[PDB]
Amino acid sequence: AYTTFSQTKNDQLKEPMFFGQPVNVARYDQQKYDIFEKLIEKQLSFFWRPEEVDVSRDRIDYQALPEHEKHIFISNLKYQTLLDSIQGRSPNVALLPLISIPELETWVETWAFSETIHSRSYTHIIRNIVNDPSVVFDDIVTNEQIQKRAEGISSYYDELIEMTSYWHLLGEGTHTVNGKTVTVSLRELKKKLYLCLMSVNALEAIRFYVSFACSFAFAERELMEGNAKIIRLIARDEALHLTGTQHMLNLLRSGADDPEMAEIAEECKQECYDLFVQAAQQEKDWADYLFRDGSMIGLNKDILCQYVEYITNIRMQAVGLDLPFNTRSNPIPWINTWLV
Amino acid sequence: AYTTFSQTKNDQLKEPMFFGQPVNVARYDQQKYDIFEKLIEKQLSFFWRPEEVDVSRDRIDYQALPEHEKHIFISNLKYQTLLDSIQGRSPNVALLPLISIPELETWVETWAFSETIHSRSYTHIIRNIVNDPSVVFDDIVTNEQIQKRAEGISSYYDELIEMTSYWHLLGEGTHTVNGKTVTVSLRELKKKLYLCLMSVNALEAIRFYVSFACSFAFAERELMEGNAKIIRLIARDEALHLTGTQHMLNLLRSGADDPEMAEIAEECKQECYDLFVQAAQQEKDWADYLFRDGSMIGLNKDILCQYVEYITNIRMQAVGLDLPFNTRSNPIPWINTWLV
Ligand SMILES: [Fe+3]
Ligand SMILES: [Fe+3]
Ligand SMILES: [Fe+3]
Ligand SMILES: [Fe+3]
Ligand SMILES: [Hg+2]
Ligand SMILES: [Hg+2]
Ligand SMILES: [Hg+2]
Ligand SMILES: [Hg+2]
Ligand SMILES: [Hg+2]
Ligand SMILES: [Hg+2]
Ligand SMILES: [Hg+2]
Ligand SMILES: [Hg+2]
Ligand SMILES: [Hg+2]
Ligand SMILES: [Hg+2]
Ligand SMILES: [Hg+2]
Ligand SMILES: [Hg+2]
Ligand SMILES: [Hg+2]
Ligand SMILES: [Hg+2]
C-alpha cells in the first residue's frame, strides 16, 4: 500500500514523522521540524570529496608500521567500512518507506548519501596502502570478530524491513499467509521502528566514536595523516547524524509528535537501556581481537574500555536514559583536538 | 528475505545488476561495469547549491509576464517539481532492494540524492517569485492535467515495489493470502523492473527535456534568468541520469548481464514501444493545456509537438526501439545553447 506519490492533498505540517501519509511533494519552504532542514543545510555545506585528500604518504607510514600496529589500524578501518556500507543503504531501505514529512525524508536521503561518500573514502585509503584491497574487503564479510562486534545491526534493520513489507501489503490485522497466522500490528511496527532508531543512535554515538579514537591514535604520532584528514571529515558528518537521531528520539519522547510514539518510548525504556549496554559490551569485547598481537602506548584494552563507558554514559544521558557506568573523566582528552 | 548485509562472501564482479545477492560491502576499487562508477564520479563533480544562484530579478520578470505566459512558466515549473519529487525517493525505494552490484547501488543513491537538490532548487525559485509558495505546491498534487502523468509514473514504481515485497517475503510460487491465490514469478518481476526502467528512461530522456524547452524559451528572451541558471544545472544532471538508464537497459536487453532479461525484453518489446509513444503523446497533450490561452516567442503547440517527436526518435533509437515518428532535424536548435 506504499506509494511513491500519494494523490491526497495533505497538510505536511500536521503529519507525524513516521507512519503518516507518504510524502508526495518535496517542498522546503516550511517544515514541521526546522531541525531537519538545518541538518540538511549543514550536511550540504560539509560536502567533501575523498579522492581529493592526499593519501600518498599513508602507504609509506603503513608499510613501516610494526605488524601489530598494522593489525590495529586495518582492523579498525574494516569495521568503519562495514558500518558505512550498512549505513549507506539501510536508512533509505528501512526508513524512507515510513516517513511522512518532507524535511525528514530528505534528511534521511542526504544522511544516507553522505555515508556512501564515507565508503568511497575507505576505498581511497585502502587502495593506496595495500597491494590487494580484495583481501581487506573480503575479510570484512568473513571476519568472525568483526561480525560479532556488529551483530544486531543488520538483523534489526532486516526485521523492520520485513515487518514494514507485511504492513504495506496486508495492513493491520490477523492474516492467513500460506496457512499460517500472521499478525500485523502497527503499534508493534512502531516499536520496531523506534528501537531501530535507538540502535542507529547507538551506532552513531558510540560505535563510530570508538573507531575514531583508534584512528586518531595514529594521527597523534604523526602517521597516516591522509586517513586522519578523512576521519576528521567523517567525524564531522557523524556528529550531524547523531544530532539527527537524538532529536528524532527526543521529539518522539516529548509527545509533541505521534502520541503513541511517546507511550512507546516510555514502555520500551528498558529495551533502550539494554541495547546500549549490549552495544557497549560488544565494543569492549572487540579489544581482545584488536590487541591480540600487542597494544600501543596510550591505546590498549583498558583505555578502550574506559572510553566506551565514558562515551556511553554521555550518549545515554543525551536521550534520557539512566547511566549504566561509573562516572569518570575523559580517559583520552587528546581526542578532542581531532573531533570538531 | 532482503538483507542490509548479506553474510555470504561473494564475487561482486560476477553478480547480475539485479536480483542477485544483496550488496554487502560497498567498495569502489573495482566494478563489473565501469560506467556506473564514472557516472558517480561525474555527478559528484557536478555538485551545486541552488541558494547560490541569484533569482532576485525573476520576481519582477514573472509579474511583468502576460497572464498566459505566467501560466506556461508556472505550469512547467510545477511539472518539473513533480518529476523530481518522485525521482528523489523512488529510485531508492524501488531499486535498492533489487540491486546486486555495489557500483549500481551507489549510483542509484547518488542519482536519487541529486534529485533532492533539484527539488530544493525549485523551492528556492518558487519562494522568490510568488509570495505564497503553498498555492503552487498544493496545485501539484491536485492539478488534473499534471496528475494524469503523475499516476502513470507512480504506478510503474508502486507495482514494482509491491511485487518486490511479495518476492522478498514469500519467494517464487503459488501462495495463498486470506483466501486468495497470490502467484509470485521472478520472471514477471523482471519484466516489471524492465518496464519500470524504460518508464524512468522516458521520464529522464523525454519528459524532462520537453520541460527544458519550455524553461529555456524564457531564457532566450533574457527573462527568468535565475530559473534558467538552475534549470541549466539540472539539465546537466539529467543528462547523466539518462546515460545511466540507457546503459542499464542496453546491458539488460543485450543478454550480457542476464539472459532471462534479454529474453523478456524482446518478449514485451511492442509493449515498450507503445509505452514510449504513450509518454510522448502525454507530453503532446500537455503542451496543449500549456498554450490554451496563447503562445510566446519561440514556443507554441506545434513547435513543441515537433520537439517531442524529434527527441523521442533519438531516445527510442538509443535503447533499440523502432522510430515512431518521421525523421527531422532539431526543431529548436537554439536549445542546444542550454543543454549538454
Ligand atoms: Fe559514516
Ligand atoms: Fe553516520
Ligand atoms: Fe532532477
Ligand atoms: Fe533525473
Ligand atoms: Hg533504523
Ligand atoms: Hg536499526
Ligand atoms: Hg576501535
Ligand atoms: Hg579505540
Ligand atoms: Hg518493547
Ligand atoms: Hg527509550
Ligand atoms: Hg572499563
Ligand atoms: Hg523504475
Ligand atoms: Hg518506474
Ligand atoms: Hg513544457
Ligand atoms: Hg516545451
Ligand atoms: Hg518491455
Ligand atoms: Hg518502454
Ligand atoms: Hg508533431
Amino acid at B61: D
Query: What does each C-alpha distance from B51 to A86, B59, B318, B325 come to in angstroms?
Result: 31, 15, 35, 41
Which chain A residues touch B82 with a CB distance below 8 Å? 5, 25
Cα distance between residue B24 and residue B4, in whole Å: 7
Kind and range of the H or E run holding A204: none
Cα distance between residue B174 and residue B287, in whole Å: 45
A26 touches chain B (CB under 8 A): yes
Crossing angle (nearest 10°) for helices A67-90 and A225-254: 40
On whether the CB atoms of residues B90 and B248 are closer than 8 A, the answer is no
Residue A299's beta-bridge partner residues? A296
Which chain B residues touch A81 with a CB distance below 8 Å? 25-26
On whether the CB atoms of residues B310 and B335 are closer than 8 A, the answer is no
Number of other CB atoms surrounding residue A180 within 10 Å: 7
Q: Which residues of A are annotated as a binding site for Fe cation?
A: 84, 115, 118, 204, 238, 241
Relative to beta strand B180-184, strand B173-177 is antiparallel
Kind and range of the H or E run holding A268: none
Q: What is the CA radius of gyration of chain A?
A: 21
Judged by DSSP in three states, A104 sits in helix
- Count of alpha carbons within 13 Å of B98, Cβ hemisphere only? 27
For chain A, how far is it from start to end, CA to CA, in angstroms?
Answer: 43
On whether the CB atoms of residues B196 and B156 are closer than 8 A, the answer is yes
Experimental determination approach used: X-ray
Residues contacting residue B82 through CB under 8 Å, at least 6 positions apart: A5, A25, B140, B146, B149, B150
Kind and range of the H or E run holding A173: strand A173-177
Instruction: Find residues 150-169 of chain B whose CB sits inside 8 Å of chain A.
Output: 150-151, 153-154, 157-158, 161-162, 165-166, 168-169
Number of other CB atoms surrounding residue B147 within 10 Å: 16
Residues contacting residue A316 through CB under 8 Å, at least 6 positions apart: A273, A276, A322, A323, A324
- Whether the CA torsion B157, B159, B162, B166 is positive or negative: it is negative
Q: Which residue has the cell 523478456?
A: B264
User: Which residue of B lies nearest to A144 if distances are taken between CA atoms?
Assistant: B7
User: Which residue of B lies nearest to A111 if distances are taken between CA atoms?
Assistant: B113
**Grid coordinates in use for B202?**
522516458
User: Which residue of A lies nearest to B152 if distances are taken between CA atoms?
Assistant: A5
- Count of alpha carbons within 13 Å of A165, Cβ hemisphere only? 24
For chain B, how far is it from start to end, CA to CA, in angstroms?
Answer: 42
φ/ψ bin of B300: left (φ > 0), alpha (ψ from -120 to 50), beta (otherwise): beta
Measure A257 CA to ligand 5 centroid, in angstroms.
18
Cα distance between residue B338 and residue B340, in whole Å: 7
On whether the CB atoms of residues B255 and B262 are closer than 8 A, the answer is yes
On whether the CB atoms of residues B275 and B198 are closer than 8 A, the answer is yes
Buried/exposed A108-133: b ≥16 CB within 10 Å, e otherwise: bbbbbbbbbbbbbbbbbbbbbbbeeb
Active-site entry in A33, A62, A79, A122: A122
Which value in Å is the resolution of this experimental model?
A: 1.7
Out of A4, A81, A153, name the one closest to residue B93 (CB). Answer: A4
Measure B103 CA to ligand 5 centroid, in angstroms.
24
Relative to beta strand A173-177, strand B180-184 is unpaired
Residue B253 burial by CB count (10 A; 0-12/13-18/19+): exposed, middle or buried? buried
Cα distance between residue B310 and residue B287, in whole Å: 15
Residues with CB under 5 A from ligand 15 (ion): B 210, 213-214, 304
Which CATH number do you get for residue A234?
Answer: 1.10.620.20
A2 in active site = no
- Count of alpha carbons within 13 Å of A63, Cβ hemisphere only? 9
Report which of A222, A66, A58 is spatially closest to residue A127, judged by C-alpha positions: A58
The 3-class SS string of chain B reads CCCCCCCCCCCCCCCCCECCCCCCCCCCCCCCCHHHHHHHHHHHHCCCCHHHCCCCCHHHHHHHCCHHHHHHHHHHHHHHHHHHHHHHHHHHHHHCCCECCHHHHHHHHHHHHHHHHHHHHHHHHHCCCCCCHHHHHHHHHHCHHHHHHHHHHHHHHHHHHHHHHHHHHHCCEEEEECCEEEEECHHHHHHHHHHHHHHHHHHHHHHHHHHHHHHHHHHCCCCCHHHHHHHHHHHHHHHHHHHHHHHHHHHHHHCCCCHHHHHHHHHCHHHHHHHHHHHHHHHHHHHHHHCCCCCECCECHHHHHHHHHHHHHHHHHHCCCCCCCCCCCCCCHHHHHCCC
Q: What is the CA radius of gyration of chain B?
A: 21
Query: What does each C-alpha distance from A83 to A77, A243, A294, B125, B246 come to in angstroms?
Result: 10, 18, 25, 37, 32
Domain enclosing residue A247, as ranges: 1-340
Q: What is the dihedral of CA A99, A100, A103, A104, to 10 degrees?
A: -20
Query: What does each C-alpha distance from B310 to A83, B280, B303 come to in angstroms?
Result: 47, 10, 10
Instruction: Find residues 42-71 of chain A whose CB sits inside 8 Å of chain B.
Output: 44, 47, 49
A7/B85 Cβ within 8 A? no
Test the B interface: residue of A2, A28, A30 with most B CBs within 10 Å = A28
- Count how many domains chain A has: 1
Amino acid at A245: T
**Per-residue DSSP letters for A28-64?**
-S--S-HHHHHHHHHHHHT---GGGS--TTHHHHHHH
On whether the CB atoms of residues B175 and B289 are closer than 8 A, the answer is no
Measure A214 CA to ligand 8 centroid, in angstroms.
4
Residues contacting residue B270 through CB under 8 Å, at least 6 positions apart: none
On whether the CB atoms of residues B340 and B236 are closer than 8 A, the answer is yes
**Grid coordinates in use for A290?**
584488536
Q: Which residue has the cell 575514531?
A: A212
Cα distance between residue B36 and residue B245, in whole Å: 10
On whether the CB atoms of residues A43 and A110 are closer than 8 A, the answer is yes
Cα distance between residue B269 and residue B264, in whole Å: 8
Report which of B12, B21, B291, B284 is spatially closest to residue B148, judged by C-alpha positions: B284
**How far is the alpha carbon of A85 from chain B, nearest alpha carbon, in Å?**
5
Q: In what order do the strands lie in the sheet with B173-177?
A: A180-184, A173-177, B173-177, B180-184
Query: What does each C-alpha distance from B229 to B55, B226, B298, B307, B323 come to in angstroms?
Result: 9, 5, 19, 22, 33
A114 touches chain B (CB under 8 A): no
Kind and range of the H or E run holding A294: none
Residue B182 sits at φ, ψ, to 5 deg, of -125, 110
Q: Which residue has the cell 507518504?
A: A22
- Whether the CA torsion A262, A263, A267, A271 is positive or negative: it is negative
Amino acid at B138: D
A27/B141 Cβ within 8 A? no
Q: Give pairs for A311-317: CB < 8 Å, separation 24+.
A: A311/A205, A311/A206, A311/A209, A311/A210, A312/A206, A312/A276, A312/A279, A312/A280, A315/A201, A315/A202, A315/A205, A315/A206, A315/A242, A315/A276, A316/A273, A316/A276
